[PDB]
Symmetry: none
Subunit: 31 residues, 9 copies
């Protein structure tokens, strides 16, 4: 009995001039 949980959060609020910003999220799970 195996339980794998992955959670990622990115929050941005009240901003200006983020030209070419990168928000990358990667998640991998194996068995």
């Amino acid at each position: 009995q195996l339980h794998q949980q992955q959670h990622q959060q990115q929050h941005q609020q009240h901003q200006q001039h983020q030209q070419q910003q990168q928000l990358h999220q990667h998640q991998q799970q194996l068995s």
Copy 2:
């Protein structure tokens, strides 16, 4: 009995001038 969960969230609010920004989300699961 295997349970794999992956959650990703990106939230952006009240913004201006994010030309060519990247919001990339990648998820992989294997068994």
Copy 3:
């Protein structure tokens, strides 16, 4: 008894000038 769940959310609200922005979402599952 295998259970694989993947969830991805991108939310953008109240914005201006995001010319050529990329919101990409990728999900893969294997067994």
Copy 4:
């Protein structure tokens, strides 16, 4: 008695092989 001026110039002369080049100009004014 407010006076706002914005000027932008891009000049290119006598060139070759600029495949997929970007000349972007952005201007914003508020009151």
Copy 5:
């Protein structure tokens, strides 16, 4: 009595092989 001036110039001359070059100009004024 407020005077706001913004000037931007990009000049390129006698060139070769600038594939995928970026000439970006951004100007913002607020009052």
Copy 6:
């Protein structure tokens, strides 16, 4: 009585092989 001036210049001459070069100019003024 306020006077705000911003000047930016980028000059390139007689060049070769600047693939994926970036010439970015940003200007902001507030009151």
Copy 7:
């Protein structure tokens, strides 16, 4: 008696998910 040769090869085999990949080949010769 001038001899100029240029050869370029790109080989891809047995692949998956290369969205928006770029395979660019450039060749120039002068005399």
Copy 8:
């Protein structure tokens, strides 16, 4: 009697998830 040769090879095999990868090849010869 001048002999100029340029060879470039890019090989990729058995791959997955190379979104927005760049395989660029540039060759220049002058006389």
Copy 9:
């Protein structure tokens, strides 16, 4: 009697998750 040779090789095999990787090859020859 001048002989100029340039060889470049890039090999990748059995890989996963190389998003936005760059394989650039540049070659120049003059006389």
